[PDB]
Amino acid sequence: ERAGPVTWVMMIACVVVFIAMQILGDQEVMLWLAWPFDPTLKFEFWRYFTHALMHFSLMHILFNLLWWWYLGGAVEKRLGSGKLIVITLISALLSGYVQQKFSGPWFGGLSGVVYALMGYVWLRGERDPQSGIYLQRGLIIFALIWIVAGWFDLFGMSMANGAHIAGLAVGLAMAFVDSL
């Protein structure tokens, strides 16, 4: 076994975008992929999602893709590709919405999606062991530490706190729905 097609294509997409950001510069890529930052861009539908594909540091991309590979891969394997797609689209969209509302359109990263997956896998395992999916103990601890670090700004980088919490919320909400 190994990462399914959705898991894989997201990782590829993130790496391609990250390479473009090194070659072209972060600003140039943000012009194309960021959440609409002018009313002229409001119909460029991709922008409501493609903010999730941009990363600004090595630490940021590595840890997000690590979590995505593990939790995304697990969701895809056990619950199917379709489920992972829907979690991803909902969390990207809502996390982006909340972030721009609090802090404006200049943000990016897969962590809204990652927080959704953390909450989803944990709550689904908790409420519905039958599902086969759960977040084992050690990972609960490491997810908590990761969350706490963003919240209290312990990576010396400016954090997208709205994206992070909206993400988590979405994941928990979808687990709750699915566990009924």
């Binding site: 972060d26 943000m30 903010h51 999730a52 990363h55 600004f56 540091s57 940021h60 997000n64 996390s95 972030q99 802090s103 200049w106 943000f107 990016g108 990263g109 897969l110 962590s111 809204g112 990576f155 980088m157 400016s158 954090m159 997208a160 706190n161 994206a163 992070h164 993400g167």
Partner: peptide, 4 residues
């Protein structure tokens, strides 16, 4: 820029 804010990091998600």
């Amino acid at each position: 820029v804010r990091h998600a």
